């Protein structure tokens, strides 16, 4: 019974830790998505300036 309690406690902590890690990776994935949007927008604006200048 004592060993079962110990193992259950460690497994519960492991579940909590993996939940925290999954939330953290969600946050960082969202941040990378935002920065990818930033690069898309800046490249699009540079292309717009290029086409405006080449087309007067």
């Amino acid at each position: 019974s004592d060993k079962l309690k110990e193992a259950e406690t460690r497994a519960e902590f492991a579940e909590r830790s993996v939940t925290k890690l999954e939330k953290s990776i969600d946050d960082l994935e969202d941040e990378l998505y935002a920065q990818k949007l930033k690069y898309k927008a800046i490249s699009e604006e540079l292309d717009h300036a290029l086409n405006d200048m080449t087309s007067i």
Binding site: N51, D52, T54, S55, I56
Partner: protein
């Protein structure tokens, strides 16, 4: 009250209240019924997604444009598009607003009469007026003369105007436009291995055409350069990955405008139908038309067309005349801006086709004095 300046177009419906700078709501004019079976219950699946909603669910729809070449081929779908435009994109009931539709030149009468009959019976507007799509584009430029080449997505037409007096015998309407360029691009992409067939993938090819294609200043030199170096190959990422590389398909797609023999059309390019339209005019207004050539419509947004066209016309025209091509940056919405200006005029306020007039003469009122 304020007037509704709608502009059916063919490919993008542009609408908004009169007196502004830009249309309030711009969205593709496609109505797509779902084609698969559907197993989830209670998902709230509608029977037809119209407008910009069907450009997001296009993976399981069969989009079909209700306007083929200026003319309207499927009246129920067009009615659905108008109903959406009035109620969901502008949220103004049509019972309290005049409308100003636009129509290409030389279109069938029945199309215009059915349009006015719908607007007066179904939507029950107070008064509607139909205007030629080129006069508005001439309004927006702030000119009063000039020959305007309005290369839309359905049909390209070239209306010359002098001192406000339109020349009805010199209108040259050609049915090559953006849609045929999309189909030709989709047909020449197959030379590298990329096959687009579904009506949904036509939208992807349209996006490729918009973002990559450009008009070459000199065609043979570009064909020779693209066949030796590799400085032209621009890549593009499909909606799922697998980037593609477009080589000399870049300037071969929009070259069809100046050589309609590519898609098998007999007629001459947009560089020579303008000169022919000028030469049909009288001998004393040709200088002014030469100096005030106006471009409009979406398809004239290709990077480098305002120079190719000027070079071609200068080659054709006499050496003394000055050739100038007006290409405003707001080309796409030029027709709608002109429509707003025309609807905002006080002198124009008595030209609307009032409903009592329609009740007395029937739908054939549009061909009468109220043009």
């Amino acid at each position: 009250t304020t007037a509704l300046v709608c502009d059916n177009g063919s490919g993008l419906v542009k609408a908004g209240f009169a007196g502004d700078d830009a249309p309030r709501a711009v969205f593709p004019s496609i109505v797509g019924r779902p084609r698969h079976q559907g197993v989830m219950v209670g998902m709230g699946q509608k029977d037809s997604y119209v407008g910009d909603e069907a450009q997001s669910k296009r993976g399981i729809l069969t989009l079909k444009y209700p306007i083929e070449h200026g003319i309207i081929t499927n009246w129920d779908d067009m009615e659905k598009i108008w109903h959406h435009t009035f109620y969901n994109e502008l949220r103004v009931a049509p019972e309290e607003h005049p409308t100003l539709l636009t129509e290409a030149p030389l279109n069938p009468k029945a199309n215009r009469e059915k349009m006015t009959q719908i607007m007066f019976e179904t939507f029950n507007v107070p008064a509607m007026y139909v205007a030629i799509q080129a006069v508005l584009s001439l309004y927006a430029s702030g000119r009063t003369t000039g020959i305007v080449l309005d290369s839309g997505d359905g049909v390209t037409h070239n209306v010359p105007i002098y001192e406000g007096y339109a020349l009805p015998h010199a209108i040259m309407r050609l049915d090559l436009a953006g849609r045929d360029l999309t189909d030709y691009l989709m047909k020449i992409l197959t030379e590298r291995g990329y096959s687009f067939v579904t009506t949904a993938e036509r939208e992807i090819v349209r996006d490729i055409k918009e973002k990559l294609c450009y008009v070459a200043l000199d065609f043979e030199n570009e064909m020779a350069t693209a066949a030796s170096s590799s400085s032209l190959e621009k890549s593009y990422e499909l909606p799922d990955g697998q980037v593609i590389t477009i080589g000399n398909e870049r300037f071969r797609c929009p070259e069809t405008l100046f050589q309609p023999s590519f898609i098998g059309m007999e007629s001459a390019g947009i560089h020579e139908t303008t000169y022919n339209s000028i030469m049909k005019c009288d001998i004393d207004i040709r200088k002014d038309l030469y100096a005030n050539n106006v471009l409009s419509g979406g398809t004239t947004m290709y990077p480098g067309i305002a120079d190719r066209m000027q070079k071609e016309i200068t080659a054709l025209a006499p050496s003394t005349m000055k050739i100038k091509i007006i290409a405003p940056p707001e080309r796409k919405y030029s027709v709608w801006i002109g429509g707003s200006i025309l609807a905002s005029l006080s002198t124009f306020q008595q030209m609307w086709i009032s409903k009592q007039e329609y009740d007395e003469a029937g739908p054939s009122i549009v061909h009468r004095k109220c043009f």
